[PDB]
């Protein structure tokens, strides 16, 4: 897959960041190369249309690296994008949810109406703590989370299991 | 400008946030309405092409609300997007500047490359001024800073001189 290769070629791996023993998979070069970014968005959009047809109402992007992809993916799909932010940033009435990093994500109580169907996007799935918190917040708005997606998944951390029974899809997988 | 109206009509204004007496201009509804987001990006893109022609090499997006616009703006211009983050988030070697601290990878840009910085909102201009400094340390040329919203009574534009500034919408 030439397009998937365009994305994989622009992942930069940094050993021992942020702590010794791990490897940080940096999506920065994907953003810097417009052909790579277009490829990433297209692959995610194509997967989502092939899987949900027209059932998706909104994309939810996760603060902060998910913000890089959410609006472009939403645009490609003809949809709006709603924001899930670190706590303290959003005006009006909010809900929030913890997750070990303790950190907290937040959403405006009026971000979605009950029954609206959403796909959550972030750059990278690791432990799945952040994505889990996002799922909880959306569920508390009585939104239906159709799927969570990322560019990169770290399979040995088993974040995917943690989101079950919500489906997950990543472009690329590393241990 | 009906395109501009599509953006302005989706700004939501919250009094007394984050502190009493200030009005918060919430751009969330612009993102939630795909026609509004498209208009915003289109208006910014057209301004930048009309002003700089082919001179721009990259868009730089400021963490975090700048990340919402920078990639889409870059894509509309056929450009890549480099990232300026809060300190501690980028791997590898970085430069940082305090204003809170911002950070950029040392190889984000090469000397002589020309960049336009984007953020959602210009207030005091502290964040944007720091970003300009960092880019300068890479010997990049900042052509312009742009935002969706500018709060004119805070005189952030004057902080950025002599770098030009452009906003879609202005509020006292």
UniProtKB/Swiss-Prot annotation, chain A:
Residue(s) carrying N6-acetyllysine: 109
Subcellular location, principal: cytoplasm
Gene Ontology MF, one: adenine phosphoribosyltransferase activity
Modification Phosphoserine, positions: 2, 13, 28, 64
Keyword Acyltransferase applies: no
Matches recorded under SUPFAM superfamilies: PRTase-like
Pfam name, any one: Pribosyltran
Gene Ontology BP annotations: adenine salvage; AMP salvage; GMP salvage; grooming behavior; IMP salvage; purine ribonucleoside salvage
Keywords: Acetylation, Cytoplasm, Disease variant, Glycosyltransferase, Phosphoprotein, Purine salvage, Transferase
Pathways per UniProt: Purine metabolism; AMP biosynthesis via salvage pathway; AMP from adenine: step 1/1
Cellular localisation: Cytoplasm
UniProt xrefs under HAMAP family: Aden_phosphoribosyltr
PANTHER family, A to Z: ADENINE PHOSPHORIBOSYLTRANSFERASE
Subunit structure: Homodimer.
Function: Catalyzes a salvage reaction resulting in the formation of AMP, that is energically less costly than de novo synthesis.
UniProt-recorded name of the protein: Adenine phosphoribosyltransferase
